[PDB]
Ligand binder design. Structure first.
Ligand SMILES: Cc1cc2nc3c(=O)[nH]c(=O)nc-3n(C[C@H](O)[C@H](O)[C@H](O)COP(=O)(O)OP(=O)(O)OC[C@H]3O[C@@H](n4cnc5c(N)ncnc54)[C@H](O)[C@@H]3O)c2cc1C
Ligand SMILES: NC(=O)C1=CN([C@@H]2O[C@H](COP(=O)(O)OP(=O)(O)OC[C@H]3O[C@@H](n4cnc5c(N)ncnc54)[C@H](OP(=O)(O)O)[C@@H]3O)[C@@H](O)[C@H]2O)C=CC1
Length: 518
């Protein structure tokens, strides 16, 4: 009797969840977040070089036409402080904070089968009740780097990229970075010119393409805002929602000289998804096609990195091109006299002293600062860190013991009245379009519940297994069977448009696979 819905999360997913349910469906709803301000991961992740993978004019909401026309499009891609300022504007305009309880982590969510609602308890023993639970948790857990003996003995600055403190200075300091993923590449490229010396501890070299983050002219921004309606229709009609001309052309169907200029054109425009999916249509499907994309980036590495032994060290061994990163000058950094690259697969880290990282060759790497760009736990980690218990009292820890399974990426069997926003078993595409799709869909169902006097919604065990069927069927058709994440399937790989088709069919067929109770 407290609320119609409780929302966990104050980022992209939770913000739109609260706006949709409160202002478009007149529900009484409260949102909770451990943060002190809106933003989600854009409020937490403030490491150097933090940048969006998707272009500025698309990494935003589409449901507010006035916001689209007044939005600031400063550069082709948007930095973390600017995303945070955008989400704070969204909360300002739509009067959202008055229904968000900040500095409040939820500890447990217990489904009350008798009354058909959720018992939600914060970490300060505050207990709320609500008919529906909206979980917009994102992806977060941060595996710091234990496994390395003696990391707790380090006397210098030790930061994980997810907990990046304020007022970090780099001048005159010897800095080390562990991790060469998307975050590591961004930090390394941003700080190398600022430090006295940078040591990169690379376990696995990955492919990276230029992002081409350039300033946007008054004319560039005007052409976007004049054609914004068509731009978003292309997003809903695409597989990735990145504004790309998604290619159908086979990689080997063109000559070697034509293939080189197609890759070169995308290399100049910039963009990771552009290089994989705007160039040709079978790079993630055919091995001969994939190797062609590998050899182009491998050739680009050996031209940029003048030292052939450093270039060889940066070249991915046998890793096939599956999600290459984007960078703003990552390969050029290793030409600097103050940058050292350490292959910690052939020369592993064995211990950390009070003042250094020591490798297996005995070399002590003196450091004033050690940055851990080591990553984040699995996508179900944010859910397992919650004490959620549905029917018969089973917890999501037990139910997802062997990975996350769901119906349409939004519903979990044995967990009624719980709807996941940007959760696992979802599509691989631009996140704001995915979040908007799922939030509009979930709100449509809850409105269908208030109209039809329904107080319990639950997915069946077989609709979930049917979802695992279509995800595994599409996934096993693509090259994503070597170094990724994902018989539990983690992602639906049919694209955004087919995901919206799939989810529209069951909303048009009386929510097939859902157990509606009155
Ligand atoms: C630097 C960066 C750049 C990215 N760029 C792109 C891009 O270009 N394109 C793209 O498609 N994706 C991108 N992503 C990924 C994706 O867009 C983000 O994960 C996205 O912000 C997800 O939004 P969200 O609201 O669902 O989750 P989040 O933004 O992570 O918000 C989740 C919130 O829930 C809160 N929360 C969780 N559990 C609890 C609890 N128990 N109690 C209280 N609060 C809780 C957290 O504190 C957090 O504030 C990027 C991610 C990062 C980190
Ligand atoms: N817009 C963007 O481009 C961004 C996207 N993201 C998203 O966030 C997710 C996380 O990105 P990231 O933060 O890079 O997390 P990642 O897991 O992608 O990067 C992990 C890095 O840490 C290294 N590592 C982990 N453990 C060790 C160890 N014990 N010793 C040495 N090296 C180690 C890994 O090496 P190995 O590979 O050998 O395990 C890898 O290089 C990505 O999936 C990405 O999609 C986040 C920020 C920016």
């Amino acid at each position: 009797m407290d609320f119609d819905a409780i929302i966990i999360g104050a980022g992209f997913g939770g913000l739109y969840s609260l706006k949709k349910l409160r202002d478009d469906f007149n529900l009484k709803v409260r949102a909770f977040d451990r943060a002190t301000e809106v933003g989600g991961t854009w409020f937490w992740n403030q490491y150097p070089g933090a940048l969006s993978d998707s272009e500025t004019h698309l990494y935003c909401y589409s449901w507010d036409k006035e916001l689209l026309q007044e939005m600031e499009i400063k550069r082709k891609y948007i930095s973390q402080p600017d995303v945070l300022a955008y989400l704070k504007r969204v909360a300002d305009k739509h009067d959202l904070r008055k229904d968000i309880q900040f500095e409040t982590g939820i500890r447990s969510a217990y489904f009350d089968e008798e009354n058909s609602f959720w018992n939600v308890t914060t970490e300060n023993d505050e207990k709320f009740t609500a008919r529906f639970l909206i979980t917009a948790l994102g992806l977060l857990a941060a595996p710091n780097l234990p496994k390395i003996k003696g990391i707790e003995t380090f006397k210098g600055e030790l930061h994980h990229t997810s907990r990046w403190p304020k007022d970090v200075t780099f001048s005159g300091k010897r800095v080390g970075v562990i991790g060469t993923g998307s975050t590591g590449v961004q930090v390394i490229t941003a700080i190398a010119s600022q430090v006295k010396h940078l040591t990169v501890f690379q376990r696995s070299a990955q492919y990276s393409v230029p992002i081409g983050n350039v300033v946007m002219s008054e004319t560039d921004v005007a052409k976007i805002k004049e054609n914004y309606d068509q731009i978003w229709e292309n997003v809903w009609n695409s597989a990735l929602g990145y504004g790309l001309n998604e290619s159908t052309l086979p990689t080997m169907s063109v000559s070697a000289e034509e293939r080189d200029k197609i890759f070169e054109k995308a290399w100049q425009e910039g963009g990771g998804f552009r290089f994989m999916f705007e160039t040709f249509g079978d790079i993630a499907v055919d091995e001969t096609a994939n190797i062609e994309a590998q050899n182009f980036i491998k050739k680009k590495i050996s031209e940029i990195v003048k030292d052939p032994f450093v270039a060889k060290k940066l070249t991915p061994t046998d890793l096939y091109a599956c999600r290459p990163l984007c960078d703003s000058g990552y390969y050029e950094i290793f030409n600097r006299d103050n940058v050292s690259l350490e292959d910690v697969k052939a020369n592993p880290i064995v211990e950390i002293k009070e003042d250094c990282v020591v490798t297996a060759d005995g070399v002590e790497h003196k450091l004033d600062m050690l940055i851990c760009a080591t990553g984040f736990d699995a996508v179900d980690g944010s859910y397992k860190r919650i004490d959620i218990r549905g029917k018969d009292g089973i917890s999501i820890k037990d139910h997802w013991k062997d990975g996350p399974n769901s119906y349409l990426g939004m519903m979990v069997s044995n967990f009624p009245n719980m709807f996941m926003v940007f959760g696992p078993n979802g599509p691989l595409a631009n996140s704001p379009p995915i979040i908007e799709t799922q939030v509009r869909w979930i709100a449509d169902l809850i409105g269908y519940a208030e109209d039809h006097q329904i107080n319990q919604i639950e997915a069946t065990k077989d609709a979930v297994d049917n979802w695992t069927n279509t995800c595994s069927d599409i996934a096993n058709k693509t090259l994503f069977a070597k170094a990724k994440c994902r018989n539990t399937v983690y992602l639906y790989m049919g694209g955004l448009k087919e995901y919206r088709n799939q989810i529209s069919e069951v909303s048009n067929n009386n929510y097939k696979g859902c157990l509606l109770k009155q």
